[PDB]
Design a protein around this nucleic acid. Structure first.
Lengths: 136, 51, 51, 50, 250, 217
RNA sequence: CGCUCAUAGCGACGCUGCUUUUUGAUCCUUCGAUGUCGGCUCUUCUUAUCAUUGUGAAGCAGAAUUCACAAAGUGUUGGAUU
RNA sequence: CUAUGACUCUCUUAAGGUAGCCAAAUGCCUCGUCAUCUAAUUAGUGACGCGCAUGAAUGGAUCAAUGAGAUUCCCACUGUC
RNA sequence: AUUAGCAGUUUCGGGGGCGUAAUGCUCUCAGCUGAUUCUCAAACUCUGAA
């Protein structure tokens, strides 16, 4: 799932961390944390984490949030990777700290996206682009 | 009026507090479609009447 | 502890409910005494179904 | 269970057309009462010589 | 090897033990978890088909065979045919997982089938709703134990059904035979306690008072009315619990 | 078989063990019924005979035999009327197969009930044959023959080894051909006993047909 | 069995096989000692091909499956529990 | 027997597991059942407990303080990966 | 050890139309007995292997 990239996949993979990394929910829904289970499309090989997306969809969970949203897996969307990258451009976007949002399995983000969102992510997921006034 | 007379099913709901919920819904179902067994009990209120 | 069935007779034992008691008390003409004897009422009810 | 010692067959005495009763008969505005048969005092005194 | 010796323990455990504790001595048989069960509930296949070993041990695990003499002492028989059969029929089996599951299911069915008498009808009846009883059993989080009998479990579950909440149910029709003038008094007394219908008043004849009493505390109830009355009398019953009357909230 | 795949009971070996006053756990054979069709039908009314015969000495199982019979059972409406049908097998599984069981089936090593005292409980009942002994026979009228051979054909698959089908020149279950088995009726010196025949007794009997006449009725 | 229809797809009762990836039977080699089990690591290998490619079937309209062949060239994962 | 077995009756080898406690470091069946803890738990912990084969100075039950003690769970400075 | 029909029967077993149930007629079953056939037996053999 979902899947819709992009055109392209907005080029190479970069992560803040793979499996077992907290990033904030950045969402009006009362998920307060997002912890990764795994990432979609990772086919992977012998001993290698299923590694965080640059703006791609993930199997996640609400570890600390609303108890209703707590437990039960959730497809999400990575929004900003603390750990850095170069783009086809020659810039190195880098962030304060990791972040994403909990989302629908057609990609759609629920409420409104908080804070700054890398443009690649927006490009990937049109709903994301729609539901924010910050796309930097 | 019914195209084919009498199509029914004696279903039952799930979880204890939502037993009258079904009944309540069937009051709204009446509004929607002309036939449902909510008014006048012949086969009990947990039964559909359709064509 | 009955030698035989009845209704006409009694030993202050068993049951046998009828329409006579609720309508207008004792039964005369059609029988000497009202039915308060023979197999008890519940049993009677059961047995009809069975046969 | 006394009558099931004769053994009604699984196809012909339990048809798919003849299962309209386990989950197709909970219908009562008027009537659908089925009582448990036989009554004779207690569970020890019901049948002793019988 | 060196110092490093492939032991891998005595002989593999991989079959149903059937532990029979006769003459204070354990005798056991190589069978299978399912096969024994099958045998003991009707499916009488062959004696050495249900038994992977048609002989008797004293410790199936440790690989020890019993003395003929012991058998003779215990069972009064030498031939392994009879002894084996006995062991199969009346010794402690090890069920599988499948068998365990089946047992559990059976228990579940018989704490809704026994509770079908005291069933959970919705707002109106719709009198049976046995499916809904079954459903309700695990919605409360109940230990459907296969150790205890069904009846006991039924008793337990109704108490919980009270704190579901949807009230305890257990009503029948007690037809009390009451002679002389104290019958009337008794009737008067018990009218607030339980329901009174199909009544009659007689000084020279018995009174057929039909009440709607508790069924799962019925005997006790019966005991404490006669005493109140003073004189000895007869109070007939149905079976245990019946769904002739109302079982919606009652 | 059930405990075995019939590959260890393919070939004749060891002397005959049977359902005896020495064995006793011996199971009942898989068929105790050996005829199929009109057994009332006469020796004379049916004059057509086909056999089934092995070419190699092999131990046919009772189950196998049963299976074989219930081809020819079902090839009967396909044939055309059970009325025009006889069968008799003519090989009864008298002999019994031994099975020392391997107590280990999911694990556990004997060397104690291993191969010591390792003598079979009888399980398996079976019939021996040779290089031409009959294993099915069919009496019938001369209508069905391509039908019966097809039934046999089915039967052939249900049996181990290379079989063979021969049409006897007899009238089916009789020691006379047809050239002979008209002369008996024609000359009228036959004597009948239902499904069998008898024949009058001159070189059959002599000391008891010396001063006798009741022996020409 | 499969609406129909034995073999599209299965296939009862029955028979013939392969296999040495189960375990037993065995005790030929080693008790003047081959370092026992597992997991990490890593190559190579076999096909009884899961994907892949090229194909043939179907009860294959499509998507989705199911069955067969050629074919081992390349791929065949991250955890929780033990 | 609605029944966990209070209670009665009997048999041996005298007594017949009381109060407690438990799939415990004690429970084979066994990954016991129900519950929680987890995205997922043969792990832990609460409960249940006709307990293979628990149990009262063979000492039973609990528990502050302590422990290079055994187990788990969470925060815990992220080259173990 | 063990299969198959056939024959004489059975008021000596049982049930049908007739007849006293019938075992009498006309059908099937049960048992006995007589004539034949199937297959056969390491711990069987009338017979017999250099």
């Amino acid at each position: 799932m979902s899947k819709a990239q992009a055109v392209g996949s907005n080029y190479r993979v970069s992560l803040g961390l793979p499996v077992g990394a907290v990033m904030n929910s950045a969402d009006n829904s009362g998920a307060k944390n997002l912890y990764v289970i795994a990432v979609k499309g990772i086919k992977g090989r012998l001993n290698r984490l299923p590694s965080a997306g640059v703006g791609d969809m993930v199997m996640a969970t609400v570890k600390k949030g609303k108890p209703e949203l707590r437990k039960k897996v959730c497809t999400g969307l990575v929004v900003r990777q603390r750990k850095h990258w170069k783009r086809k451009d020659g810039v190195y976007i880098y962030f304060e700290d990791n972040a994403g949002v909990m989302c629908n399995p057609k990609g759609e983000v629920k409420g409104n996206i908080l804070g700054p969102v890398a443009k690649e992510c927006s490009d990937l997921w049109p709903k994301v682009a729609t539901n924010a006034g910050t796309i930097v | 009026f019914e195209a084919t007379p009498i199509v029914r099913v004696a279903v039952e709901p799930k979880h204890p507090s939502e037993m009258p919920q079904l009944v309540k819904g069937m009051k709204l179902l009446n509004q929607a479609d002309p036939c449902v067994q909510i008014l006048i009990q012949e086969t009990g209120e947990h039964v559909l009447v359709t064509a | 502890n009955e030698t035989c069935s009845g209704g006409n007779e009694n030993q202050e034992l068993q049951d046998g409910c009828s329409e006579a008691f609720e309508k207008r008390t004792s039964q005369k003409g059609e029988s000497p005494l009202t039915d308060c004897y023979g197999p008890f009422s519940g049993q009677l009810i059961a047995t009809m179904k069975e046969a | 269970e006394e009558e099931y010692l004769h053994f009604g067959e699984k196809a012909d005495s339990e048809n798919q057309a003849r299962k309209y009763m386990n989950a197709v008969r909970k219908r009562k505005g008027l009537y659908v009462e089925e009582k448990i048969v036989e009554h004779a005092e207690k569970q020890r005194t019901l049948s002793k010589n019988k | 090897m060196s110092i490093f010796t492939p032991t891998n323990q005595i002989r593999l455990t991989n079959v149903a033990v059937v532990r029979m504790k006769r003459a204070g001595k354990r005798f056991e048989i190589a069978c299978y978890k399912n096969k024994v069960v099958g045998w003991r509930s009707g499916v009488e296949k062959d004696l050495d088909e249900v038994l992977q070993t048609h002989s008797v041990f004293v410790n199936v695990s440790k690989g020890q065979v019993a003395k003929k003499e012991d058998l003779i002492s215990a069972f009064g028989t030498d031939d392994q045919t009879e002894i084996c059969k006995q062991i199969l029929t009346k010794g402690e089996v090890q069920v599988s997982d499948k068998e365990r599951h089946t047992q559990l299911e059976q228990m579940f069915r018989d704490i809704a089938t026994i509770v079908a008498d005291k069933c959970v009808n919705p707002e109106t009846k719709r009198p049976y709703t046995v499916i809904l009883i079954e459903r309700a059993m695990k919605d409360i989080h109940y230990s459907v134990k296969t150790n205890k009998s069904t009846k006991q479990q039924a008793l337990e579950v109704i108490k919980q059904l009270k704190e579901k909440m949807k009230i305890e149910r257990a009503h029948m029709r007690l037809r009390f035979i009451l002679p002389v003038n104290e019958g009337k008094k008794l009737k008067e007394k018990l009218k607030p306690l339980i329901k009174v219908i199909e009544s009659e008043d007689y000084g020279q004849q018995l009174e057929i008072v039909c009440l709607i009493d508790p069924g799962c505390f019925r005997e006790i109830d019966e005991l404490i009315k006669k005493e109140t009355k003073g004189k000895g009398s007869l109070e007939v019953l149905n079976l245990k619990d019946v769904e002739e009357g109302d079982e919606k909230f009652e | 078989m059930g405990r075995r795949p019939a590959r260890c009971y393919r070939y004749c070996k060891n002397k005959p063990y049977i359902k005896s006053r020495y064995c006793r756990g011996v199971p009942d054979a898989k068929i105790r019924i050996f005829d199929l069709g009109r057994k009332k039908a006469s020796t004379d009314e049916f004059p057509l005979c086909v056999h089934l015969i092995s070419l190699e000495k092999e131990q046919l199982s009772s189950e196998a035999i049963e299976a074989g019979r219930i081809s020819c059972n079902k090839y009967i409406s396909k044939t055309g009327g059970k009325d025009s049908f006889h069968m008799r097998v003519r090989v009864h599984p008298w002999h019994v197969l031994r099975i020392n069981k391997m107590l280990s089936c999911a694990g556990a090593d004997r060397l104690q009930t291993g191969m010591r005292g390792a003598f079979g409980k009888p399980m398996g009942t079976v019939a021996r044959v040779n290089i031409g002994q009959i294993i099915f026979s069919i009496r019938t009228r001369d209508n069905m023959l391509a039908n019966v051979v097809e039934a046999l054909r089915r039967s052939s698959y249900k049996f181990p080894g290379r079989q063979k089908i021969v049409v006897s020149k007899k009238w089916g279950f009789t020691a006379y051909n047809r050239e002979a088995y008209q002369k008996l009726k024609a000359d009228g010196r036959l004597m009948n006993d239902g499904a069998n025949v008898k024949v009058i007794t001159n070189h059959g009997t002599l000391a008891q047909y010396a001063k006798d006449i009741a022996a020409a009725n």
